[PDB]
Fold:
Amino acid sequence: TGQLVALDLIHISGGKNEPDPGELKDLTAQYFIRFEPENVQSTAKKQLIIRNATHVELAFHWQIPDRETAFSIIPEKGILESHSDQEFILSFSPYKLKCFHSVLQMVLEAVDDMIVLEIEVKGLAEPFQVLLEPYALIIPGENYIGITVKKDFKMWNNSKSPIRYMWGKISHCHIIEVEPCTGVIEPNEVGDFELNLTGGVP
Amino acid sequence: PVQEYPGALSITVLRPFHEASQWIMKKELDTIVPPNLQSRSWKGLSIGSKQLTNIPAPILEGPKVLQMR
Amino acid sequence: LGFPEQSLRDAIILDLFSHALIFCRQQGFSPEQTSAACAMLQDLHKACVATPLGNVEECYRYFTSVLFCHGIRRPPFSIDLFKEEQLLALADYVVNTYFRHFKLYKYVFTP
Amino acid sequence: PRICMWKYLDIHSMHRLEKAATVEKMREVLAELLELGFPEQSLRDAIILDLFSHALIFCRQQGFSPEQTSAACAMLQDLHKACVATPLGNVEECYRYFTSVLFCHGIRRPPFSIDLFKEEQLLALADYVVNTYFRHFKLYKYVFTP
Structure:
């Protein structure tokens, strides 16, 4: 018996894709994998399923080779098995605030009768979800010259962003210092910073 | 407590303010768009003392001006 | 476009789109809002040069309509692509040469 | 590069322009002063009138002293003439020409210059100038050059 290649794909939510691709590869209705708030380290993890109906020992080519930096696909090699479910891991790690888009082309060369399959991937990155408590710190009382006072305030980054950061103080007399000057938060990690005030101006 | 004054206690008040004209109004509904058509990312005219139920003002996470006393 | 040295019209268009690319390269439109405003300028160029008669107000209203189509969220006829500061700025664009230099482009691109 | 004060518009014409508080009346006064014809018969005169009129409008928007008014008007007219004096591409030569002309007004050394002006206003021009016209240089080139 002679066989063809039919694109039978399943979303992460179990939504099937139309046989003999008519909705999967329509230019107006190209399936658009848009992402919810995704940060820069924990990639946008989505699973797509590709169905096989033959035992052919053939390879496949993923064109956009493979995308680097902002997109990662798992696995990248391996010839599938007959009647086996080929799961593909899509990882989206944006590099900037602007929302990124990528086009993935699955080249299939078995032979309308059938053409290459195209993927649209889009994902947005939140600029900063860093919150400070208290956003204003005041030293109640009268500090004499040469007297230092330190207070601890707590910062959390409710996002998947262990982004390094710097702490710059507008001080004309080196009155106020903060430790650490530089630091690396972790995803959803909350950090305690100490601010020291060594002022002496009347 | 004051680090220098014995027994004295200094009290500080923080209040967010308006970055621009106070007379710039804000509409009752920030958006009039159907809760689902958005692209996801009663009592009588009692002119008397009807309590203005100030909805706890949305917690301004880092407001741009803090009034201090 | 042909070489800018052989046709002054292509030179003018290339300069317009070159100042398009060089300006917007900071504060930040994403490539989406980018191609949006970019086709905005091209489309209103075509609309303004569509007739030799003066059509400043009509093209102005057309630009503002398409502007609010790119500033208001209502699919499939309008997309929340630009911000309010950005959208007022976009309004500030086409106002502020393409209806005063409107006579220059009118002389150039109306046979 | 010389002092262009009270060269094309004197104090009387400027006072006439000042009494014209509205855009349309001031455009009429500028057309009367520049000896330009009706904007409806020639596009070049219309372009020149619109340029000078909007120029006066934004200069109203900021605010300065009258000798500055006449200096800026005469310098605009002179550099427009220089830009349209030849049909060949001459952006950088007019660039450097009026670069030299600035110092004849921005720094105090008579009789080649006079300190009528401030650094902030200058840099404002460096700004607005290199922003617009040498970008739109081809537009005026196609119109005012043979």
